[PDB]
Every structure is written in structure tokens, then in C-alpha cells.
């Protein structure tokens, strides 16, 4: 009866191919789910809404590529870490302007809403203009319909995206900023359940099936 919150759409971590939800997470939490014989139903929304839905306690955890920060450490709480990632720039295949993370200067940058992808650009960047959307389909067709100069989010999505979907229509700039881990988020006060999903993420560790479940989505072992 846990109701775990995803992401409408974040490939390659979660989303719908055909009638249910596919991805890296959906795997790692339905192993886990079995590691501990816990009982569930996901539930998808825009990544916006996850935190929130936490907070009110309407959703009792969460994946959805979730980036851990001590920012939000005060809000909601994380276990111990499942997957490192970083933020890319794309643009399109044949741009010109763009070798780096230099939309610092006024560049229009399209952007997610409620992701760190926003935080980053704030602190970071110079953007003439900053776009966001509640999914990042919506940020490519605005790089693709050329409403914006580049796109800026996770490495992992941007790279599966331009290989699979966005192939000879975009392409990755520069290498991956902003080291980052994922980690699997809870209400505050849900401890009983969280050092102890820490406990299955070590066994999943331990045991190579992570190393299966990461080699599915990525082609490859971790190390």
C-alpha cells in the first residue's frame, strides 16, 4: 500500500512504454521493493509536484532521479545513494556558437521547472532568457523549433535522448557538470522506512543485481 511518486517522463529512469512504466528506476525500486517485501503502487507527476506531494505526505516516496542536496535536506529526506549524474548542454547538431556552458552570456537556456537544472542556471549562468516547462519534451521541441539556444539537464537523459530519439537533430556540448548522486527521497519521520531501504540498497550492491539492473538501461557494469 506504499505509493510511491515518479516522474511523468525521465528517461531512461522512468518512463511509459506502451501501457506501464519502464526504466532504471522502476527496476531498482521493484527489486528493492522485493529485497524487503514491501507492497506498492507508483504513481506519476510532473517532477514539480514530488517534492510537495512528499511534504504533504499525499505520496510516501519517491524516484524520480532525484538529485540530493543539502538544500533540500531540509525538506525531505534521502538514503544513502544510488547513482551519479551531472548536468550536459545540448544544442542543435550543427550550432555553432555554443562549445561549453557559456550561455553565460545572454543565450536563451529551456530548462524543467523544479529541477536543479533551474538552480544551476541561477547561480550560474548569465541567460539572457530562461524557459522552463514542466517536462523536458517540451524544452527540446523549443531547442528543435529554435525558441531557445540550448537545453540543460541531466547527462544520463540527454545522452539517452540524442542517441535514441534526438539522433542527427542534437548534440551533447562540453562534458558533465555538477557531480551529483541520486538517492531515493521519503517524508521527514519516515526513518523506520528509510535506514533500512539503505539496507536493501547495500544487498542489491552486494549481491551484483544492481550491477544487472545498471548494465540493462546504461550497456555496461558500474565499475
Given at each position: 500500500?506504499?505509493?510511491?511518486?515518479?516522474?511523468t517522463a525521465?528517461?531512461?529512469?522512468?518512463?511509459?512504454?506502451?501501457?506501464?512504466?519502464?526504466?532504471?528506476?522502476?527496476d531498482?525500486?521493484?527489486?528493492?521493493?522485493?529485497?524487503?517485501?514491501?507492497?506498492?503502487?507508483?504513481?506519476?507527476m510532473?517532477?514539480?509536484?514530488?517534492?510537495?506531494?512528499?511534504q504533504?505526505?499525499?505520496?510516501?516516496?519517491?524516484?524520480?532521479?532525484?538529485?540530493?542536496?543539502?538544500?533540500r535536506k531540509?525538506?525531505?529526506?534521502?538514503?544513502d545513494?544510488?547513482?551519479?549524474?551531472?548536468?550536459?548542454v545540448?544544442?542543435?547538431?550543427?550550432?555553432n556558437?555554443?562549445?561549453?556552458?557559456?550561455?553565460?552570456?545572454?543565450?536563451?537556456?529551456?530548462?524543467?521547472?523544479?529541477?536543479?537544472?533551474?538552480?544551476?542556471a541561477?547561480?550560474?549562468?548569465?541567460?539572457?532568457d530562461?524557459?522552463?516547462?514542466?517536462?523536458?519534451?517540451?524544452?527540446y521541441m523549443?531547442?528543435?523549433?529554435n525558441?531557445?539556444?540550448?537545453?540543460?539537464?541531466?547527462?544520463?537523459?540527454?545522452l539517452?535522448?540524442?542517441?535514441?530519439?534526438?539522433?542527427?537533430?542534437?548534440?551533447?556540448?562540453?562534458?558533465?557538470?555538477?557531480?551529483?548522486?541520486?538517492?531515493?527521497?521519503?517524508?521527514?519521520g519516515?526513518?523506520?522506512?528509510?535506514?533500512?531501504?539503505?539496507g536493501?540498497?547495500?544487498?542489491?550492491?552486494?549481491?551484483?543485481?544492481?550491477?544487472?539492473?545498471?548494465?540493462?538501461?546504461?550497456?555496461?557494469?558500474?565499475?
Amino acid at each position: 500500500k506504499l505509493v510511491v511518486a515518479t516522474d511523468t517522463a525521465f528517461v531512461p529512469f522512468e518512463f511509459k512504454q506502451g501501457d506501464l512504466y519502464v526504466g532504471f528506476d522502476v527496476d531498482l525500486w521493484a527489486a528493492i521493493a522485493k529485497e524487503l517485501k514491501l507492497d506498492y503502487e507508483l504513481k506519476p507527476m510532473d517532477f514539480s509536484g514530488i517534492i510537495p506531494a512528499l511534504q504533504t505526505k499525499n505520496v510516501d516516496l519517491a524516484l524520480a532521479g532525484i538529485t540530493i542536496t543539502d538544500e533540500r535536506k531540509k525538506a525531505i529526506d534521502f538514503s544513502d545513494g544510488y547513482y551519479k549524474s551531472g548536468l550536459l548542454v545540448m544544442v542543435k547538431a550543427n550550432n555553432n556558437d555554443v562549445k561549453s556552458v557559456k550561455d553565460l552570456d545572454g543565450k536563451v537556456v529551456a530548462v524543467k521547472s523544479g529541477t536543479g537544472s533551474v538552480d544551476y542556471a541561477k547561480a550560474n549562468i548569465k541567460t539572457k532568457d530562461l524557459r522552463q516547462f514542466p517536462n523536458i519534451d517540451n524544452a527540446y521541441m523549443e531547442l528543435g523549433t529554435n525558441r531557445a539556444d540550448a537545453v540543460l539537464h541531466d547527462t544520463p537523459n540527454i545522452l539517452y535522448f540524442i542517441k535514441t530519439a534526438g539522433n542527427g537533430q542534437f548534440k551533447a556540448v562540453g562534458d558533465s557538470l555538477e557531480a551529483q548522486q541520486y538517492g531515493i527521497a521519503f517524508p521527514k519521520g519516515s526513518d523506520e522506512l528509510r535506514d533500512k531501504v539503505n539496507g536493501a540498497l547495500k544487498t542489491l550492491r552486494e549481491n551484483g543485481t544492481y550491477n544487472e539492473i545498471y548494465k540493462k538501461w546504461f550497456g555496461t557494469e558500474p565499475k
